[PDB]
Amino acid sequence: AMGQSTSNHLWLLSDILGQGATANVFRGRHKKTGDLFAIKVFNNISFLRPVDVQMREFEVLKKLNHKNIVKLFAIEEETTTRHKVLIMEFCPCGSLYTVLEEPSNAYGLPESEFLIVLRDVVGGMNHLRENGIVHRDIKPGNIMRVIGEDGQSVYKLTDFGAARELGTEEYLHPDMYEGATVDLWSIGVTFYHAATGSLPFRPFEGPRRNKEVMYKIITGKPSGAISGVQKAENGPIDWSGDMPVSCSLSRGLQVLLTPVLANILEADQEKCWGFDQFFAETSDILHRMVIHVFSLQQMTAHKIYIHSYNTATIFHELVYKQTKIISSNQELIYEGRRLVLEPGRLAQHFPKTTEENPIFVVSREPLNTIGLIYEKISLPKVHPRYDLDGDASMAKAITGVVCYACRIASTLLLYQELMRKGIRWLIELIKDDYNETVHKKTEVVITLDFCIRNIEKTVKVYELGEISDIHTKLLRLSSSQGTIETSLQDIDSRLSPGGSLADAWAHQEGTHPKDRNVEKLQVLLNCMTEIYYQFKKDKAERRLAYNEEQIHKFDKQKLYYHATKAMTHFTDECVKKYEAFLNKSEEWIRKMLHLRKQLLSLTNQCFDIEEEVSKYQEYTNELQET
Amino acid sequence: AMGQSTSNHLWLLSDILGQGATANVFRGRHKKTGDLFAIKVFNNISFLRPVDVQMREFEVLKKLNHKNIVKLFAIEEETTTRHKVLIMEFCPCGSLYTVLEEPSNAYGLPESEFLIVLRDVVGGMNHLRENGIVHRDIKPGNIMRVIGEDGQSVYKLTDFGAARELGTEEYLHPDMYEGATVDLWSIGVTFYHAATGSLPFRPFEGPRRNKEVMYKIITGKPSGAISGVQKAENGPIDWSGDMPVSCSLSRGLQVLLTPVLANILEADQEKCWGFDQFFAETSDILHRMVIHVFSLQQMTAHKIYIHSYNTATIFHELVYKQTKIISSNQELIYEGRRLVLEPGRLAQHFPKTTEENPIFVVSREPLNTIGLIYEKISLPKVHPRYDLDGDASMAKAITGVVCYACRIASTLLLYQELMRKGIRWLIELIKDDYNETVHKKTEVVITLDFCIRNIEKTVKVYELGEISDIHTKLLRLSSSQGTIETSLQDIDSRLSPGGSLADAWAHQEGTHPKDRNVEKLQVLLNCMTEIYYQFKKDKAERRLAYNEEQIHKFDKQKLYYHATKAMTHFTDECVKKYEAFLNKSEEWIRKMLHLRKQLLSLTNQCFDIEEEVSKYQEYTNELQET
């Protein structure tokens, strides 16, 4: 074998991790402890030979300590070549680029993981600003990832400060492509990339020979837009000031994220934010807590980004901006019961919200049932070419699509299981509004009983005009009360099991966790992703043996069969059942809004008559005489 | 390289899978399709040379098709040696032994996974009984595992019917060690092993030289017992007719599983079940559905194994047998509201129960708060010896213990999060019993109002004895009603936030999912299990190089530090917080049982007076005259 060594460290040249322009990164261990470290060996060191200036540049990075920055442990010299070797912190998981290489993140990172990336990157750059050093060359490849003690990812920076001695091509500022504006540029490109899984500004044949057109895209500067992609060869550029539909981010977050990118992605130094403005808006998002809310009327889940110190007034406002529901009509349901929120109640004392257990929202005004809005992405055509590079690229693509389909499928199941809960709670919450009307009826019933037989007694002792008038008046009330008594039993007949309102259809329509459709999709998805990582190990081998050449061709054909089998099961089973559940949901809503309209009126026809039987009890029942 | 071939198949000798006495199993592919198959090459074929009798014995296994049986595809001859090669179905996951090799199953398989094992093994043997063939040599190594289309494991048999041409040593029947009784023996040993993670009958130094004592254990035949283990060298045998505390199986299942094993684990052919009796009891368990129930009083979760055709009467009975709660006192809570079950309601129409969303049970009779009962298992002492075999054995042991601690930790968090829900539901369910008392009070209030001022009017028109008597009687009621009116406000003061009953302590005591204690435990557990599988790759290498020898020693010492760090965090954080939550839970229960006792009496002091004000309204209020 072949491996370099040091006074305290040693490493094989086969354990290469990073191939830079100035230095190379190797997986190395310590001679004594055996603990793994990152070995940064300086290549091309001869025309410089610094032992005075650069030495102190390494003595400053040593004491530089932060959670969002890869730690530099020591500066040692190679045994033979006497090259300056940096003992860096080893990150077993890799970088942000490695994460984006996964098909599960082909259409953007998970929302929770994205918030971690945002939090760490901002914290890292801010710490570098405190020391004055500017990075600019901030790429997902320069953002390492480690697993913290709590299992959550922690992102760190590393490849910075190499501008004094010497941005990435797809992360270059237009004026830099030819202040701190050029630094904040690549950050937005990184942030968009992490949220989309794709670059913001893409030509047709990629950023290579057609990258001459790519510079025209950036210099085009459409201000508010954050995406410039041509869907055809040397055609027009499709602009967009919003994020793709395939984005895995919630609607609440996109509203806050969009203006951040738009104000850091333009050539104008007068329209672009500074690091203070950038830090302010970013820190604002990171501080906010999440309130899970599922609108039963629209069959849509929502994530309201609000501060803990904000009141319920702003909460109802934010819900309206995402659901188009007036605050005075936003009726809340939680944990099976109705939930009343005070206009000035802080967000710290809000109930425990989860994607699986949120705060349902029901309204009285008619709302169209929308459901989940996603992008219909079909499988890409697989070419019979043997191109190992192309076989690895298309493997990442075709697997990412199925990942998206499996992502939507689990969400479609989420919406249905959430629907069954909200409906089950609602019908029982309606019964609560039925039991109160009964108790608000019996109070009127007893009232007339001690008003009828009290005036029927006064006249049976044996004037007549007043007697007959009240008698007729009380009869027109006890009768009108009689029909309401019966019509409420009709409502109770509706609330009864199998009473044209029961949720028997909800358990007999869409898909259920018993079907295990997501697990079935994952099985095929595992078969594909296994082949994918294998094709990565085939691309690195440049060429394969005859035996491995055939296996590569076999698995490539089985990659299509796996994807096709999964895509069929998704549309013909998961989707179709969802369409059926969505249909009978919009029907039951109308039948429910109609009922609540009845019960409301029938209840209001008890309060107005409660005041009518109050102006008679204090009248003839109590005459006057010395 | 070195690899054998066939007319249609080929395989490397390095891809060995099974090392049997008669044949070897290799990972092989097809020459055309490239699909992977299991290659069974016959070793020691010379003194037999069968081409007539044995050929048909392979022609019968070909048409033999079942889900719980490994499929035999074809019978081909080797190119050079002309050995009889069986093209078997390849099982990438391995066998049941492979599953038990995992530290996560060191103390038994998960309950769901165990039910799959039971279901498949029974279905497999039953199919073999239909064909008449008996296996007897049923070992976890002879039970393969594959992943079905729905993601769930599927277990199959394979190494059977090799008795005609020719049980495992730890799976031998006592009379066989020296009817179909000898067949059902190894099944119970397998079933115990899967549920415990350990053999039922173990000497001290293992089943080797001290296995002479092991035969004394089996021939000891304590009938009802199912375990025989000596904790000391050549000491007494500790018998047990029940399963260990570390068993991951629910209490409901153990009650059904115990008699099954006890009746198939004894030398007596008169006390042992037949295959019909065995199939009946096993199929009975597999057909039953699971009802999740969490007793708030005892802070214990329960899994009631009941049939779908059974009524709620048997349900309440089964709950009593596990919670010691009388059926007439079992008050049910579900989905935030109280749940009323009809005595003859089928189990098919029971609500959706989950371990995370079960049916809570509250009682009126005082119950001691038990909580989770588990076995306190400490880390085993690690010896400084270099023994690779011993280093791999202790790695499986020390990792399995931490797995158990992480298993309990997630359960301790489950019980607490379940506690917070049941309490939150209860306090709101009490308010429901408070709002009814109010409505059952106002009916009495209005009653006396039209009874007081109706008799105060009759006497103010200006006999006297009757007048004064009723007046005093109504005063003793309106007054006694007045104090109840105020004492209920005291209860409402208790139900009010911060009213010596609020669940503010529940969110400020034990551990929460925000702490991520389980994730923290998993991080260290991942570091350990990685080292474990590495030690397996070191044991197979017999000896290691100098470099790898030191790394082995380094990771071995870091294996202790990982386990110690995890075990400390478990006891000092996860456990201690659980003890505090358990303490303040037992206190709040008494304060809740006391309140419900008050509200009950205060409610009963409204019904008995409702009938008192009913015998006066139909009296003097309605006199008599012509």
Ligand SMILES: O=C(NCCCNc1nc(Nc2cccc(CN3CCOCC3)c2)ncc1C1CC1)C1CCC1
């Ligand atoms: O600082 C740079 N590159 C960063 C990307 C590669 N460098 C590293 N990679 C890693 N880990 C890593 C990189 C790529 C893939 C993986 C995942 N596997 C781990 C071991 O097995 C193979 C890959 C791990 N750790 C630390 C570092 C150095 C300290 C910043 C510049 C590029 C040359 C210097």
Ligand SMILES: O=C(NCCCNc1nc(Nc2cccc(CN3CCOCC3)c2)ncc1C1CC1)C1CCC1
């Ligand atoms: O039938 C037997 N042995 C069963 C155990 C090994 N045989 C098999 N193993 C397997 N798969 C397997 C066995 C052990 C480990 C693993 C997991 N990895 C898969 C590939 O990489 C290494 C191990 C897989 N499939 C099929 C079979 C034969 C058809 C029953 C007798 C023992 C000689 C015949």
